[PDB]
């Protein structure tokens, strides 16, 4: 039965509940008060057919517009943010260096907007996904005195082949700033406790949910002035969305209807296709990861003129 249990498990362990005795000297020291342990006997976990099923779903359902609404069915609006979240969930593959196949997006948003709900929805569906806040990553060494274990992990290493949902990204100190900076352009976190210089592989896709300081976002003020993030860190983000709420007359009404229906029926107000299983995304990533779609030469051309005109308009705007 050894190695059948891991810290990230919910199990129904069946065993013989036995009184381990304090045999020795602390024996007379304590007395009749025994210590107990469970001699485990049977562990029951709780936690191409699928390829055909997902292929058929591709034929029937439009993945681009369906999976987006499937990510956050109970969150109204912000569809394009969900579409970008799909790209983060899948992610390109460019392991060859000369680079990286991890997509990172930050949602500057606005207080009162369901950024945290989107982060939790991503965490609960993304394999190897974790959710954390800035104020309570990194790592700690030798937490228990007795056993004296070595190189305990943190929050970024757990989502190694997954996503870290760093809520309250702005409210996160300089030590974690350096840690996430190392993770972002190295995919491997390291420590220097006692000159060991050991490192932990954390190839985690980063999903940040920073919110503006001084409460509500100010559209008049410059975006980097509204959130206390250095331009060096933000500029390295692959895609960035500023998604703030505006008081309207119809969006709020539909939002209220949605939320109240959820409260009545304990279920989403189903009005369109809402796939639930995440195994389709797993099949897609496992399928095209070996494929590694090769870019076309005409693609490279169109993107070089795309960069030329993008830089031109960037100047002409400034």
């Amino acid at each position: 039965l050894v190695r059948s249990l891991s810290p990230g498990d919910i199990v129904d362990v069946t065993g013989i509940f036995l009184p381990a005795p304090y045999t020795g000297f602390k024996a007379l020291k304590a007395g009749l008060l025994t210590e107990t342990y469970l001699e485990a006997q049977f562990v029951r976990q709780h936690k191409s057919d699928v390829e055909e099923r997902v292929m058929e779903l591709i034929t029937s359902g439009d993945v681009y517009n369906r999976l987006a609404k499937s990510i956050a069915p109970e969150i109204y609006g912000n569809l394009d943010v969900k579409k970008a979240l799909l790209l983060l969930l899948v992610g390109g593959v460019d392991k060859r260096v000369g680079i990286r196949g991890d997509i990172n997006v930050c949602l500057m948003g606005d207080p009162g907007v369901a950024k945290s709900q989107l982060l939790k929805a991503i965490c609960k569906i993304s394999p190897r996904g974790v959710y954390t806040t800035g104020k309570g990553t990194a790592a700690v060494m030798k937490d228990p005195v007795t056993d004296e274990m070595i190189l305990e992990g943190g929050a970024l290493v757990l989502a190694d082949n997954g996503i870290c949902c760093i809520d309250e990204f702005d409210k996160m100190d300089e030590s974690d700033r350096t840690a996430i900076h190392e993770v972002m352009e190295q995919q491997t976190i390291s420590i220097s406790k006692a000159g060991i210089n050991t490192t932990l592989n954390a190839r985690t896709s980063i999903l940040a949910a920073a919110n503006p300081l001084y409460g509500r976002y100010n559209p008049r003020l410059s975006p980097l002035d509204n959130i206390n993030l250095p331009a060096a860190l933000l500029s390295r983000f692959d895609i960035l969305f500023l998604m703030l709420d505006i008081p309207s007359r119809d969006d709020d009404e539909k939002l209220a209807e949605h939320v109240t229906y959820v409260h009545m029926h304990n279920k989403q107000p189903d009005l369109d296709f809402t796939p639930v299983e995440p195994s389709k995304m797993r099949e897609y990533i496992a399928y095209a990861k070996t494929k590694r779609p090769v870019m076309s030469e005409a693609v490279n051309d169109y993107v070089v003129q795309a960069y030329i005109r993008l830089r031109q308009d960037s100047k002409r705007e400034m």
């Binding site: 060859r96 260096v97 000369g98 590694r292 090769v294 870019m295 030469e297 490279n300 993107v303 070089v304 960069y307 030329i308 830089r311 031109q312 960037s314 100047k315």
Partner: protein, 209 residues
């Protein structure tokens, strides 16, 4: 303290950007004669075997180079003896490379060209060579030297007495000149205190002796 400080910039222009982005796309298409590794030991061999020695022709060429740099502008102050000693260093390094162990004349003007280009880069358009050595540039220093005398004359005509900082701001930034920065006035007040022209009475009023 740095001998050569290169201002690596990526300014926008379509002519350069086209070539740069084409070269970048070459890198994208690459992955899916050059001594690549011989140089890391060639450098050590040149560092150990070669001991460059500077000669008299190089000496005359260097002295000339420094005097010329300085005169380029001589009221202002272009180059400094630290830069002279650094050039003594780049010429020695250039002689160390190529394995000649003698600082010939050519290395001298090669290093002078490098130094001159670097100075033309990291200094302002009318190359000063003092802004790098001091935040207070001459175009800035004139501001403090004007504010100190304006404050002296202002306080004088007032007594003709004294006030805290806010009142002094009232008659300086409003009509005396444009909307200048506030801390420069109290900074020039420090120079006036050193000259003993005016006295500052704590946080509040400030008069002249």
């Amino acid at each position: 303290r740095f001998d050569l400080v290169y201002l690596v910039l990526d300014k926008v222009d379509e002519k350069n950007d086209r070539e740069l982005a084409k070269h970048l796309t070459n890198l994208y298409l690459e992955d899916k004669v050059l001594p690549v590794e011989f140089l890391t030991m060639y450098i050590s061999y040149a560092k150990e075997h070669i001991h460059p020695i500077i000669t008299e022709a190089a000496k005359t060429e260097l002295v000339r180079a420094y005097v010329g740099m300085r005169k380029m502008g001589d009221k202002r102050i272009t180059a400094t003896t630290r830069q002279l000693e650094s050039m003594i260093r780049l010429a020695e390094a250039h002689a160390k490379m190529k394995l000649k162990n003698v600082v010939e004349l050519e290395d001298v003007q090669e290093a002078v060209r490098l130094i001159r280009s670097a100075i033309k880069d990291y200094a302002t358009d009318p190359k000063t060579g003092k802004i790098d050595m001091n935040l207070v540039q001459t175009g800035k220093s004139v501001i403090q030297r004007k504010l100190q005398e304006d404050l002296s004359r202002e306080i004088m005509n007032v007594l003709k007495d004294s006030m805290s900082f806010n009142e002094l701001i009232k008659q300086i930034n409003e009509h005396s000149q444009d909307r200048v920065e506030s801390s420069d006035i109290q900074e020039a007040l420090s120079r006036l205190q050193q000259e003993d022209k005016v006295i500052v009475l704590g946080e509040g009023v400030r008069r002249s002796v």
